[PDB]
Amino acid sequence: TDPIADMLTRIRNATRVYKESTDVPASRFKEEILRILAREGFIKGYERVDVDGKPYLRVYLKYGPRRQGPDPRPEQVIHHIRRISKPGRRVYVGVKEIPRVRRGLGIAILSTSKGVLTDREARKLGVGGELICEVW
Amino acid sequence: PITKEEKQKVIQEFARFPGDTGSTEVQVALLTLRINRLSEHLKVHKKDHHSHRGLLMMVGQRRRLLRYLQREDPERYREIVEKLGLRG
RNA sequence: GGCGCCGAGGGUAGGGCCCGUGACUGGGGCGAAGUCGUAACAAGGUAGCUGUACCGGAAGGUGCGGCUGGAUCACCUC
RNA sequence: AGCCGCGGUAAUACGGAGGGCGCGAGCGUUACCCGCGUAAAGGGCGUGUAGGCGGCCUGGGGCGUCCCAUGUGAAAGACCACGGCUCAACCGUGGGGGAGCGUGGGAUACGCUCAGGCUAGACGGUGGGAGAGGGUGGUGGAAUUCCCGGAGUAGCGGUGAAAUGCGCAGAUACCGGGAGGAACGCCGAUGGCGAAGGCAGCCACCUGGUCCACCCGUGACGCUGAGGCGCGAAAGCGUGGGGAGCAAACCGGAUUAACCCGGGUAGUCCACGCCCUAAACGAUGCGCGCUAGGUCUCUGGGUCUCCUGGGGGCCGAAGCUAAC
RNA sequence: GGGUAAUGGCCCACCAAGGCGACGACGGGUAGCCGGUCUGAGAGGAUGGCCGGCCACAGGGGCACUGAGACACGGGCCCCACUCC
């Protein structure tokens, strides 16, 4: 069972149907993830909520302006959201082997040796980690 | 025809403490009681395959209940297997 | 120099593998127009699909059982 | 060369000429290299082991991974610059780099190992519900076959025809009773249950699986899954054995010049054992968890503009153009 | 225990007991391995007689002297097939 993938998935299906928010299982490693995608713009932000004593991490799906012409469905922000390094197929890389996000327009969540950072934050501090997932 | 009152005895027999009605020992205990009952059934209804399947279900489940208590605490595991007459 | 063993031949018996050839058996593909015959009887139905048993030189046929499809104002059955 | 394809009186290499591309000699033929399943590709299905991956919180050691330092793996050779023949294939000189290995130090997020705590998966407890789950033991009716008794009797049972059969008798459609066996209507319904098969007159007993509710307890003891083990309609095969219906080989009429109809034994049947394919279905690469999601009809539980768990019909997003 | 490259093999003797694997060999077939070369940028497959290093092969098979190292090489000895005298 993969908690991360299952999480990033909800985020996707959340935008497809065009919802205001989506609840997810509260987790430390997940919190940081959602936190980063919020500092960039992929998501409007998140918040902690305890449902019947159960902690969650409902996130706010952010959307861009209106389409070019008479058409509802606002312009999406997260055009994609998959994971690379996952159970079974562990995928690790070094600072000199760091991947390449979608032409800067996005971030590649890397579980470096200095906390959950991105492709650049890792390149700068010169640290490598695990290819959590690439968002764009 | 049984299985309705005798449970209280079986449970309170393997109950590690007053109120315990589902411990690893209890689960296996009550589960074993079912296997014995089912076993006494197939011997009469050999042409009964369905229930025969459920037999391996509890037997397979029971063994799993054993291996667990084994790697977690082989102390109670040796006792439960003895109090149940399982492989003396 | 002599004796014995470690070694390796050869010979005998049994089994196996590879290569080449002969009386002879069965099946299949391809080349194309032809010989002969014809399963869907040229379709609600009929029929067909899959499998096994029996039968025939062959075309195949046929019974049982499990599914398709078709269809109108008309159920499938031996 | 490979492929589409050309000629039978014409487009071109069916032949040749004029023409054209490449070319420093050339060009040519031949031999060697370079994800996905609803309809080619579903195991028959199920229980499980290896194995691999494993919800939440804190901490420690610390491997894997990442980084830094040193040395070798050299040279050769590739890359960069320069020189010498100096146009190059070349050669020569210097330097940079790389993955990998060994030693030492640091790092900790995730994974890995371990300890104390949580359970939002499952199991167990209590209280309930639905179905042909399976097996065993009884019980009831229609219909079919045969005999006797009553009666009548020349025609009837059948296809569009007819033959066949009925012919001890007095048949067949009539009435009542008796013996045997098999299959078991209306309700059975886009239904339901079960591991698959398969199972549906009803009733009792043994027994399995599954759903729902309050929500205590033990505590992810998990999920899938190759061998192995058990097992599928009809079917053939061995032994014991009774009866009935139907029925392929068989027999006959007809048609023809055939499968429809009639009779019909072997046989099919029940139980044990052996055997166990294509199934079904296409919702099967298995399968699990989460996630999106409205209305209508139907099923089960507690509630009652509801929710959990199935089936069918019409969608929206998205996927697949190639079933639209 | 003998012998030597100086104990990890190997040869002889004795007692006990199994060892290895499916995260896949004992057997069959071809290829020598690597740096490296070409396709290439993809690094996957394939090939390797020339260049350098590391191994095996003296017509074949076996043993062993030689021997600091020139140690199963050259060469020598024996047998089989075969050529010449």
XYZ file of C-alpha atoms (C1' of nucleotides) in Angstrom:
711
model
C 0.000 0.000 0.000
C 1.322 3.417 -1.021
C -0.030 6.333 1.075
C 1.751 9.015 -0.959
C 0.643 7.918 -4.431
C -2.885 7.391 -3.122
C -2.692 10.950 -1.796
C -1.324 12.630 -4.919
C -4.026 10.710 -6.776
C -6.858 12.240 -4.753
C -5.381 15.645 -5.570
C -5.717 14.817 -9.265
C -9.264 13.442 -9.314
C -10.054 16.439 -7.107
C -9.196 18.923 -9.855
C -10.786 16.878 -12.648
C -14.177 17.008 -10.930
C -13.359 20.572 -9.869
C -13.770 20.520 -6.086
C -12.949 23.152 -3.466
C -11.076 20.729 -1.211
C -10.241 17.090 -0.484
C -9.505 15.321 2.804
C -6.456 13.073 3.135
C -4.982 10.861 5.900
C -2.978 13.085 8.253
C 0.743 12.317 8.079
C 4.072 14.032 8.751
C 5.799 13.084 5.502
C 2.627 14.061 3.641
C 2.248 17.403 5.419
C 5.639 18.593 4.175
C 4.723 17.503 0.650
C 1.472 19.475 0.601
C 3.359 22.368 2.196
C 5.791 22.621 -0.721
C 3.132 22.409 -3.439
C 1.496 25.323 -1.620
C 4.595 27.525 -1.618
C 4.736 27.112 -5.395
C 1.080 27.458 -6.337
C -0.026 23.921 -7.174
C -2.440 24.165 -4.243
C -4.099 27.062 -2.415
C -2.998 25.444 0.833
C -3.957 22.843 3.427
C -5.314 22.577 6.970
C -5.470 20.075 9.833
C -8.893 18.682 10.735
C -9.887 16.004 13.248
C -12.925 14.058 12.041
C -14.471 12.164 14.957
C -11.043 12.066 16.571
C -9.320 11.129 13.321
C -6.731 13.639 12.009
C -6.710 14.518 8.300
C -5.034 17.003 5.954
C -7.759 18.448 3.724
C -6.141 20.480 0.940
C -7.486 23.437 -1.041
C -7.375 22.927 -4.808
C -6.204 26.095 -6.559
C -7.395 27.045 -10.044
C -6.253 29.610 -12.588
C -8.316 32.330 -14.353
C -11.195 31.673 -16.750
C -10.691 29.963 -20.114
C -10.242 31.919 -23.346
C -13.893 32.305 -24.284
C -17.372 30.990 -23.320
C -16.349 27.878 -21.381
C -16.751 26.947 -17.679
C -14.155 24.512 -16.294
C -11.447 26.930 -15.051
C -7.851 26.511 -16.217
C -6.166 23.794 -14.157
C -2.924 24.370 -12.256
C -1.760 20.790 -11.716
C -1.523 19.457 -15.274
C 0.029 16.271 -13.885
C 1.022 14.521 -10.655
C 2.740 11.120 -10.678
C 5.491 9.488 -8.617
C 8.863 8.073 -9.653
C 10.594 6.342 -6.746
C 7.932 4.077 -5.259
C 7.699 0.772 -3.316
C 9.421 -2.108 -5.075
C 11.043 0.183 -7.628
C 13.181 2.310 -5.315
C 14.649 5.169 -7.352
C 17.438 7.247 -5.807
C 19.649 9.906 -7.395
C 22.613 12.099 -6.510
C 23.163 15.857 -6.615
C 24.908 15.427 -9.969
C 22.246 12.955 -11.092
C 19.291 15.105 -10.018
C 16.404 14.849 -12.530
C 14.899 17.706 -14.538
C 11.419 18.961 -13.646
C 9.146 20.166 -16.445
C 11.422 22.973 -17.640
C 11.544 24.682 -14.255
C 7.768 25.099 -14.331
C 7.256 22.843 -11.330
C 9.153 20.887 -8.683
C 10.483 17.353 -8.240
C 9.852 16.376 -4.618
C 13.144 14.828 -3.509
C 13.487 13.253 -0.070
C 17.061 14.517 0.270
C 19.265 14.174 3.351
C 18.111 17.648 4.384
C 14.355 17.233 4.646
C 11.786 17.025 1.859
C 13.214 19.463 -0.687
C 12.884 20.060 -4.427
C 15.162 19.657 -7.446
C 16.803 23.047 -6.915
C 16.798 23.165 -3.110
C 18.744 19.904 -3.333
C 21.087 21.055 -6.096
C 21.877 24.194 -4.102
C 22.583 22.465 -0.791
C 24.275 19.806 -2.897
C 22.232 16.889 -1.581
C 20.505 13.928 -3.193
C 17.405 12.041 -2.128
C 14.498 9.876 -3.249
C 12.392 10.687 -6.314
C 9.146 11.130 -4.383
C 7.257 12.514 -7.382
C 7.316 15.100 -10.170
C 4.579 17.741 -10.272
C 3.667 19.995 -13.198
C -25.991 -27.818 17.638
C -23.758 -26.364 20.351
C -21.880 -23.049 20.227
C -24.013 -20.522 22.116
C -23.270 -20.759 25.845
C -20.052 -22.774 26.078
C -18.360 -19.742 24.519
C -18.354 -17.941 27.868
C -16.305 -20.800 29.312
C -13.845 -21.059 26.419
C -13.328 -17.289 26.431
C -12.987 -16.892 30.201
C -10.677 -19.909 30.044
C -8.082 -18.329 27.756
C -8.882 -14.765 28.817
C -5.611 -13.188 29.950
C -7.728 -10.903 32.136
C -11.349 -10.064 33.101
C -12.852 -8.514 29.984
C -10.588 -10.104 27.386
C -12.732 -11.660 24.658
C -10.549 -11.524 21.564
C -6.906 -12.028 22.515
C -4.637 -14.132 20.303
C -5.199 -17.037 22.691
C -8.965 -16.509 22.765
C -9.259 -16.183 18.985
C -7.407 -19.456 18.420
C -9.311 -21.128 21.259
C -12.807 -20.324 19.988
C -11.655 -20.818 16.396
C -10.284 -24.266 17.234
C -13.603 -25.171 18.857
C -15.219 -24.476 15.487
C -12.702 -26.620 13.607
C -13.404 -29.555 15.920
C -17.145 -29.102 15.411
C -16.736 -28.839 11.639
C -14.413 -31.851 11.623
C -17.077 -33.923 13.376
C -19.396 -32.851 10.559
C -17.392 -33.808 7.468
C -16.850 -37.247 9.000
C -20.626 -37.604 8.725
C -21.141 -35.586 5.542
C -18.069 -36.433 3.463
C -20.048 -35.305 0.418
C -20.026 -31.798 1.886
C -17.229 -29.931 0.098
C -18.297 -26.335 0.766
C -18.007 -26.522 4.553
C -14.870 -28.592 3.989
C -13.425 -25.457 2.393
C -14.287 -23.288 5.375
C -12.362 -25.863 7.386
C -9.057 -25.041 5.693
C -10.061 -21.397 6.098
C -10.038 -21.573 9.894
C -7.125 -24.019 9.958
C -5.109 -21.724 7.721
C -6.197 -18.743 9.798
C -5.449 -20.524 13.073
C -1.909 -21.437 12.026
C -1.377 -17.790 11.104
C -2.608 -16.858 14.576
C 0.078 -19.180 15.925
C 3.108 -18.096 13.891
C 2.292 -14.549 14.988
C 2.194 -15.159 18.739
C 5.347 -17.158 18.003
C 7.596 -14.366 16.711
C 6.065 -11.774 19.042
C 6.111 -13.840 22.234
C 7.025 -17.561 22.038
C 6.239 -17.742 25.758
C 2.442 -17.760 25.522
C 2.690 -19.523 22.162
C 4.127 -22.654 23.771
C 1.416 -22.558 26.443
C -1.551 -22.061 24.108
C -0.387 -24.858 21.802
C -0.188 -27.105 24.868
C -3.492 -26.105 26.465
C -5.096 -26.864 23.100
C -3.382 -30.230 22.795
C -1.913 -28.980 19.524
C 1.200 -30.988 18.618
C 2.282 -32.090 22.080
C 67.021 -54.724 -10.880
C 62.625 -56.934 -8.555
C 57.460 -56.507 -6.157
C 52.760 -53.606 -5.311
C 49.645 -49.398 -5.783
C 48.317 -44.725 -7.594
C 47.150 -44.492 -13.321
C 44.932 -45.340 -18.016
C 44.542 -48.841 -22.395
C 42.079 -52.602 -24.401
C 38.317 -56.349 -24.148
C 33.231 -58.063 -22.537
C 28.049 -56.878 -20.986
C 23.730 -53.185 -20.268
C 21.764 -48.294 -21.222
C 21.901 -43.362 -23.656
C 23.155 -39.199 -27.201
C 24.674 -37.122 -32.161
C 25.391 -37.694 -37.592
C 24.325 -40.353 -42.554
C 21.343 -43.989 -45.589
C 17.496 -47.820 -47.206
C 11.740 -51.489 -47.656
C 7.993 -48.702 -45.675
C 3.722 -45.403 -42.649
C 0.953 -40.945 -41.374
C 0.132 -35.836 -41.637
C 0.831 -30.801 -43.354
C 2.224 -26.275 -46.362
C 2.824 -23.961 -50.873
C 1.816 -23.107 -56.877
C -2.515 -21.845 -59.675
C -6.341 -22.276 -62.885
C -9.272 -27.244 -63.091
C -12.228 -32.630 -61.717
C -16.291 -33.838 -58.214
C -19.374 -32.799 -54.412
C -21.384 -29.388 -51.199
C -22.113 -27.849 -43.911
C -24.710 -23.025 -42.787
C -30.755 -26.506 -46.414
C -29.533 -19.378 -48.890
C -32.070 -16.941 -41.810
C -38.116 -15.476 -36.533
C -37.319 -20.693 -36.826
C -33.640 -23.220 -39.840
C -28.759 -22.506 -37.894
C -24.186 -21.598 -35.511
C -20.002 -21.546 -31.614
C -17.007 -25.114 -27.953
C -16.112 -29.936 -25.983
C -16.564 -35.198 -25.496
C -18.767 -40.151 -27.073
C -20.322 -43.183 -31.446
C -20.062 -43.812 -36.900
C -17.748 -42.958 -42.278
C -13.035 -43.401 -47.598
C -14.381 -38.603 -47.779
C -18.102 -34.178 -47.437
C -18.585 -34.500 -42.062
C -22.755 -35.896 -39.595
C -24.979 -36.414 -35.019
C -26.545 -36.688 -29.587
C -26.059 -34.439 -24.819
C -24.784 -30.014 -22.145
C -23.284 -24.856 -21.462
C -23.578 -19.810 -24.185
C -24.106 -16.003 -28.611
C -26.903 -13.841 -31.811
C -31.723 -12.960 -34.294
C -36.836 -11.342 -33.712
C -41.899 -9.737 -34.464
C -48.430 -9.021 -32.636
C -45.532 -15.619 -32.992
C -43.225 -19.386 -26.845
C -38.887 -22.617 -28.733
C -39.235 -27.721 -28.806
C -38.246 -33.367 -29.982
C 17.563 -5.053 -53.487
C 11.662 -4.960 -50.201
C 6.849 -4.033 -51.237
C 2.453 -1.941 -54.101
C 2.551 -3.143 -58.889
C 3.463 -3.571 -64.659
C 3.077 -6.585 -69.780
C -1.257 -10.080 -73.144
C 0.003 -4.681 -78.130
C 2.229 -0.764 -74.357
C 3.322 4.859 -68.918
C 8.430 3.068 -66.675
C 14.128 -1.681 -66.719
C 9.667 -7.183 -71.229
C 15.088 -4.626 -74.707
C 17.793 -0.431 -76.071
C 18.816 5.042 -76.878
C 18.430 10.340 -75.352
C 18.199 11.719 -69.682
C 19.402 12.074 -63.972
C 21.410 11.389 -58.634
C 25.927 9.778 -56.016
C 30.913 9.770 -57.204
C 37.929 11.149 -56.752
C 38.035 5.570 -58.912
C 33.239 3.928 -58.386
C 28.812 1.853 -57.683
C 26.518 -3.061 -57.024
C 24.717 -8.262 -55.281
C 24.964 -11.463 -50.993
C 25.871 -12.853 -45.619
C 25.659 -10.361 -39.853
C 23.240 -5.965 -36.081
C 19.757 -2.101 -34.648
C 4.187 -2.513 -24.753
C -0.239 -4.424 -24.160
C -5.296 -7.573 -23.960
C -14.118 -5.528 -23.934
C -13.651 -9.627 -29.883
C -4.725 -13.040 -31.831
C -2.431 -12.832 -26.006
C -7.602 -15.445 -19.138
C -4.411 -19.799 -16.154
C -11.360 -23.746 -14.778
C -11.711 -21.960 -10.029
C -10.302 -21.709 -4.826
C -7.459 -22.445 -0.262
C -2.122 -21.267 0.870
C 4.078 -21.129 1.012
C 8.388 -19.042 -0.926
C 8.977 -14.060 -2.100
C 8.275 -8.790 -2.382
C 5.964 -4.717 -0.673
C 3.869 -3.018 4.189
C -1.803 2.980 8.099
C -0.506 6.405 12.545
C 3.538 8.603 16.835
C 8.477 9.022 19.338
C 13.587 7.495 19.803
C 18.347 4.942 18.973
C 22.095 2.140 16.340
C 22.744 2.358 11.726
C 23.178 -0.546 6.259
C 21.395 1.024 1.397
C 21.444 5.781 -1.008
C 23.917 10.859 -1.295
C 28.503 14.002 -0.304
C 33.813 15.089 0.777
C 39.268 13.298 0.830
C 43.418 9.907 -0.931
C 45.490 6.029 -4.291
C 45.159 2.510 -8.317
C 42.432 0.775 -12.358
C 47.569 3.827 -16.576
C 49.344 4.591 -21.185
C 46.444 3.098 -25.386
C 41.797 5.295 -27.027
C 37.479 9.106 -27.115
C 36.970 14.590 -26.022
C 39.894 19.743 -25.923
C 44.404 22.662 -27.441
C 49.084 22.767 -29.910
C 53.020 20.863 -32.952
C 55.411 17.800 -36.503
C 54.239 15.065 -42.482
C 51.374 19.447 -42.156
C 45.595 17.987 -46.697
C 44.184 13.651 -43.992
C 43.475 8.275 -42.363
C 47.992 9.319 -38.802
C 51.345 9.960 -35.138
C 53.453 12.694 -30.868
C 52.921 15.931 -26.211
C 49.995 18.040 -21.968
C 45.596 18.320 -19.322
C 40.528 17.438 -17.955
C 36.778 13.529 -16.888
C 34.151 9.048 -15.536
C 31.740 4.878 -13.407
C 33.581 1.166 -10.114
C 36.539 -0.683 -5.717
C 39.071 -0.221 -0.776
C 39.824 2.982 3.748
C 38.210 7.171 6.964
C 34.447 11.069 8.505
C 29.566 13.384 8.402
C 24.230 12.990 7.163
C 18.947 10.933 8.057
C 14.239 12.406 5.154
C 12.284 7.378 2.990
C 13.313 2.155 2.870
C 15.778 -1.566 6.126
C 16.578 -3.675 11.881
C 14.823 -3.059 16.930
C 11.761 -1.070 21.495
C 7.499 1.287 23.950
C 2.626 3.221 22.504
C -2.403 4.069 18.399
C -5.783 1.434 15.411
C -9.799 4.022 10.876
C -7.799 -4.246 7.692
C -9.215 -8.440 9.742
C -10.569 -11.794 13.629
C -13.391 -12.590 18.041
C -17.910 -11.245 21.484
C -23.349 -9.811 21.781
C -27.801 -9.041 19.305
C -30.430 -9.789 14.185
C -31.370 -10.717 8.620
C -31.449 -13.022 3.517
C -30.515 -17.218 -0.084
C -32.047 -23.553 -4.433
C -24.673 -23.112 -0.433
C -23.855 -28.704 0.851
C -25.227 -33.316 2.799
C -28.548 -36.814 5.148
C -33.250 -38.591 6.647
C -38.924 -38.352 5.416
C -43.094 -36.780 2.983
C -46.964 -35.015 -1.362
C -49.062 -34.382 -6.451
C -49.514 -34.249 -11.938
C -47.837 -37.010 -15.888
C -45.825 -41.647 -18.289
C -45.845 -47.344 -18.638
C -48.326 -52.086 -17.511
C -52.704 -55.498 -15.570
C -57.564 -56.566 -13.942
C -62.801 -54.884 -13.597
C -66.798 -51.586 -16.305
C -67.839 -49.800 -21.535
C -67.490 -49.165 -26.461
C -65.199 -50.448 -30.651
C -63.203 -49.514 -36.255
C -60.852 -46.487 -36.171
C -57.399 -44.074 -33.827
C -52.364 -42.852 -32.241
C -48.982 -39.233 -36.089
C -46.254 -35.082 -40.602
C -48.422 -31.411 -45.450
C -48.013 -37.562 -47.166
C -47.284 -42.182 -45.697
C -45.144 -46.292 -43.733
C -44.545 -48.380 -39.313
C -47.565 -49.892 -34.748
C -52.012 -51.417 -32.750
C -53.715 -57.922 -34.777
C -53.951 -63.430 -27.823
C -57.672 -59.079 -28.242
C -61.143 -55.559 -28.382
C -56.718 -50.976 -28.694
C -56.051 -44.970 -28.627
C -58.663 -40.255 -26.550
C -62.970 -42.140 -21.584
C -63.707 -43.582 -15.741
C -61.745 -45.957 -10.937
C -58.053 -48.854 -8.598
C -53.095 -51.274 -8.265
C -47.339 -51.835 -8.903
C -42.600 -49.223 -10.276
C -39.357 -45.449 -11.613
C -37.927 -40.804 -12.990
C -38.493 -35.899 -13.204
C -39.966 -32.864 -10.131
C -45.138 -26.920 -12.833
C -47.903 -21.524 -11.186
C -44.600 -18.435 -7.558
C -38.655 -18.587 -10.557
C -37.811 -12.442 -11.813
C -33.132 -7.487 -15.659
C -33.457 -12.767 -9.035
C -30.349 -14.897 -5.192
C -26.397 -18.081 -2.897
C -21.755 -20.489 -3.187
C -14.619 -21.166 -4.067
C -15.951 -23.296 -9.036
C -19.473 -26.743 -10.362
C -24.028 -26.675 -9.330
C -28.345 -26.282 -6.802
C -34.980 -23.912 -7.035
C -41.954 -29.057 -4.026
C -41.914 -28.726 0.883
C -40.117 -29.869 6.123
C -36.712 -31.117 10.217
C -31.455 -31.863 11.736
C -26.098 -31.420 11.183
C -22.817 -27.688 8.889
C -20.148 -23.411 5.708
C -19.737 -18.628 3.803
C -21.421 -13.777 3.728
C -24.094 -8.851 5.216
C -25.673 -5.261 8.762
C -25.766 -2.768 13.952
C -23.980 -0.941 18.843
C -19.388 -0.515 18.892
C -16.428 -3.508 24.128
C -11.809 -6.617 23.166
C -7.242 -8.677 20.908
C -4.359 -6.186 17.924
C -2.499 -5.104 11.126
C -1.506 -11.548 13.458
C -2.045 -7.790 6.148
C -2.920 -8.388 0.477
C -1.928 -11.095 -4.014
C 0.048 -15.404 -5.041
C 3.790 -20.332 -7.920
C 4.099 -25.964 -6.298
C 0.774 -28.933 -3.667
C -4.358 -30.524 -2.424
C -9.788 -30.828 -3.771
C -12.995 -30.140 -7.527
C -16.985 -28.838 -13.527
C -22.047 -29.587 -17.466
C -22.498 -33.646 -21.359
C -18.973 -37.527 -21.989
C -16.223 -42.496 -21.902
C -14.382 -46.535 -18.186
C -14.901 -50.868 -13.585
C -18.126 -53.357 -9.920
C -23.187 -54.082 -7.505
C -28.094 -53.149 -9.121
C -33.817 -51.811 -10.112
C -36.950 -49.020 -13.035
C -38.605 -45.153 -16.202
C -38.164 -41.312 -19.855
C -35.485 -39.903 -23.753
C -32.018 -41.097 -27.185
C -26.384 -40.876 -31.402
C -24.616 -46.175 -33.925
C -28.901 -49.539 -35.486
C -34.137 -50.459 -38.388
C -38.094 -48.568 -41.604
C -41.326 -45.064 -44.624
C -40.706 -40.904 -47.426
C -38.189 -37.262 -49.671
C -34.560 -37.965 -52.998
C -34.708 -39.808 -58.080
C -33.128 -37.703 -46.068
C -32.791 -36.175 -40.397
C -38.466 -34.850 -40.952
C -41.534 -38.749 -38.898
C -42.315 -43.898 -36.419
C -40.552 -48.273 -33.479
C -36.595 -48.806 -30.719
C -32.549 -52.598 -27.625
C -27.288 -51.701 -26.266
C -26.916 -47.216 -23.780
C -27.800 -42.640 -20.978
C -29.407 -43.223 -14.969
C -28.142 -43.611 -8.968
C -23.776 -44.522 -5.318
C -18.236 -45.347 -4.782
C -13.516 -44.871 -7.476
C -10.723 -43.256 -11.671
C -11.112 -38.909 -14.899
C -11.488 -33.580 -14.597
C -11.001 -30.219 -21.680
C -13.187 -25.830 -24.293
C -15.729 -23.258 -19.412
C -18.789 -19.592 -17.467
C -17.419 -15.291 -19.007
C -15.257 -11.576 -21.720
C -16.549 -7.446 -14.732
C -10.419 -12.774 -15.403
C -3.471 -11.287 -16.145
C -5.223 -12.510 -10.964
C -6.301 -9.038 -7.210
C -6.200 -5.176 -3.129
C -6.791 -0.084 -1.116
C -8.076 4.775 -1.858
C -10.451 8.113 -4.953
C -15.082 11.031 -8.742
C -19.987 10.199 -8.917
C -26.677 12.362 -10.168
C -31.533 10.410 -11.206
C -34.986 6.086 -11.888
C -36.662 0.570 -10.920
C -35.319 -3.768 -7.838
C -32.742 -6.799 -3.222
C -30.825 -6.923 2.572
C -30.047 -4.510 7.686
C -30.591 -0.362 11.056
C -32.791 4.140 10.408
C -36.864 6.682 7.784
C -35.007 14.123 2.334
C -30.237 8.559 5.182
C -26.242 5.360 5.069
C -23.336 0.600 4.285
C -23.370 -3.627 0.849
C -25.480 -5.892 -4.856
C -27.992 -5.993 -10.164
C -29.968 -3.323 -14.590
C -30.795 1.283 -17.633
C -29.147 6.688 -19.246
C -25.055 9.959 -18.455
C -20.714 13.972 -16.868
C -14.871 14.011 -16.419
C -11.145 11.047 -18.186
C -9.022 6.785 -20.947
C -9.333 3.936 -25.593
C -10.063 7.038 -32.588
C -9.485 2.124 -34.954
C -16.305 -1.985 -30.360
C -18.310 5.027 -30.664
C 50.958 -39.124 7.575
C 54.151 -37.973 2.322
C 55.376 -34.073 -0.721
C 55.666 -29.500 -2.412
C 53.575 -24.291 -4.711
C 55.255 -24.105 1.866
C 49.026 -25.719 4.127
C 43.707 -22.738 1.548
C 44.131 -27.596 -2.592
C 45.898 -32.194 -3.635
C 47.488 -38.019 -2.378
C 46.774 -42.286 1.503
C 44.229 -44.032 6.108
C 40.320 -43.759 10.158
C 35.430 -42.096 12.465
C 31.155 -39.441 12.096
C 27.967 -36.975 9.173
C 25.440 -35.209 4.384
C 26.980 -30.730 1.262
C 24.989 -27.597 -2.595
C 20.415 -24.239 -5.909
C 15.925 -22.744 -7.771
C 17.693 -14.900 -4.935
C 17.806 -21.697 -10.504
C 23.398 -26.968 -12.144
C 25.722 -31.568 -12.121
C 24.432 -32.284 -17.986
C 23.918 -30.699 -23.727
C 25.623 -26.660 -27.631
C 28.466 -22.472 -29.275
C 31.418 -18.756 -27.828
C 38.148 -17.212 -24.883
C 37.559 -12.851 -21.120
C 38.266 -7.576 -20.519
C 39.913 -2.657 -21.858
C 38.150 -1.662 -26.369
C 35.338 -1.273 -31.529
C 30.583 -0.313 -34.466
C 25.619 0.672 -34.309
C 24.948 4.768 -31.017
C 23.598 9.426 -27.503
C 20.250 4.079 -25.441
C 23.128 1.648 -23.711
C 20.925 -2.546 -25.014
C 22.223 -6.132 -27.989
C 26.086 -8.148 -30.786
C 31.127 -9.100 -32.078
C 36.330 -9.334 -30.986
C 42.221 -12.789 -35.972
C 45.256 -7.626 -36.030
C 46.230 -3.498 -30.347
C 47.771 -4.414 -24.774
C 47.239 -7.563 -20.526
C 45.391 -11.745 -18.327
C 44.441 -17.897 -19.607
C 44.305 -22.991 -22.496
C 46.552 -25.751 -26.686
C 53.343 -29.656 -28.234
C 48.089 -34.920 -34.125
C 45.598 -36.820 -29.712
C 45.792 -38.845 -24.317
C 48.640 -39.525 -19.602
C 52.704 -39.117 -16.099
C 56.764 -36.803 -14.663
C 62.239 -35.556 -14.542
C 64.322 -30.951 -15.656
C 63.718 -26.820 -11.996
C 66.317 -21.051 -6.814
C 62.602 -19.149 -10.621
C 64.178 -21.439 -16.582
C 57.811 -26.572 -12.822
C 53.601 -30.298 -16.606
C 57.174 -25.123 -21.351
C 60.580 -26.689 -24.670
C 61.798 -31.287 -24.649
C 61.874 -36.454 -23.179
C 59.164 -41.381 -22.363
C 54.850 -44.817 -23.499
C 50.302 -46.063 -26.225
C 46.612 -45.367 -30.419
C 45.844 -43.545 -35.771
C 48.812 -42.200 -39.687
C 53.096 -40.462 -43.218
C 58.367 -41.526 -44.809
C 62.546 -44.464 -44.553
